[PDB]
């Protein structure tokens, strides 16, 4: 990646890069606002838009999808990216667009789905789609949500909140939970999500914060792990990430803790 970010070292990705693992032959669908494929630093292998007012998945009028695409490649430089536009320029989307993106990812044999998006109430139809994706063997990763805390209540957003989906919270460069990072027993792992520098539309770069930035560190880590263990199932990849995480404190705030892709890749 052309923009330096602490987050790649923080999850111990350089150790795997040094071993020769960069996520070769792994298909990662970015279900987001698009990917600006004109970025000199991003190669997008294919895609689809399901946003009827925004018909080009290879442009990004929001900036999130391009940023997230860059983070996946910063962690897994050889991953194959797919731009699946399910959110419009305002970063908002309908359940149906998301389902269409999940179904496209199944039909096109994606290895990993990243969904840096959430709703507070969720959708039974989205649940059926993500569960189908996971049953078909896709690693499904989502942002845990930016809804902070609510006493003893879970604030994890949908679809992260569903058991089939890996819910990723955000830490800063000091491994402290970001104040915005959602919490609850559904939180699975943490990754870097504060002031992450990555690709922006119009050939730009810049820092963004959110569980949206934490999720692609884990999507990229899944790509690294599959490159070292191409025969592993999604269940095995998920188990590896959860079972080898660095514990950071109470699981309500931190889940299993910070992903350690060096440890997870065995």
């Amino acid at each position: 990646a052309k923009c330096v970010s602490y987050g790649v070292a923080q999850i111990k990705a350089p150790a795997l890069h040094s071993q020769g693992y960069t996520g070769s032959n792994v298909k990662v669908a970015i279900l987001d606002t698009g990917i600006d494929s004109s970025h000199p630093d991003l190669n997008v292998a294919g895609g689809a838009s399901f946003v009827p007012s925004e018909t080009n998945p290879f442009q990004d009028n929001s900036s999130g999808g391009t940023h997230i695409a860059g983070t996946v490649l910063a962690v897994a430089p050889s991953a194959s990216l797919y731009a699946v536009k399910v959110l419009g320029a305002d970063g908002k989307g309908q359940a149906s667009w998301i389902i269409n993106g999940i179904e496209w990812a199944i039909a096109n044999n994606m290895d990993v789905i990243n969904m840096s998006l959430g709703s507070p109430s969720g959708s039974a139809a989205v649940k059926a789609a993500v569960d189908k994706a996971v049953a078909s063997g896709v690693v499904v990763v989502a942002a845990a949500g930016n809804s902070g805390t609510s006493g003893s209540s879970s604030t994890v957003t949908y679809p992260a909140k569903y058991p089939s989906v890996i819910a990723v919270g955000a830490v800063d460069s000091s491994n402290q939970r970001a104040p915005f990072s959602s919490v609850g027993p559904e939180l699975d792992v943490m990754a870097p999500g504060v002031s992450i520098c990555s690709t922006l539309p119009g050939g730009k770069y810049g820092a963004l914060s959110g569980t949206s930035m934490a999720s692609p560190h884990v999507a990229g880590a899944a790509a690294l792990i599959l490159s070292k263990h191409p025969n592993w199932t999604n269940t095995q990849v998920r188990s590896s990430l959860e079972n080898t995480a660095t514990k950071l404190g109470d699981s309500f705030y931190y889940g299993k803790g910070l992903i350690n892709v060096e440890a997870a890749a065995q």
Binding site: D32, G91, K92, G210, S215
Partner: peptide, 6 residues
């Protein structure tokens, strides 16, 4: 549109 970028 209840889903938002995170």
């Amino acid at each position: 549109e209840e889903y938002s970028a995170m």
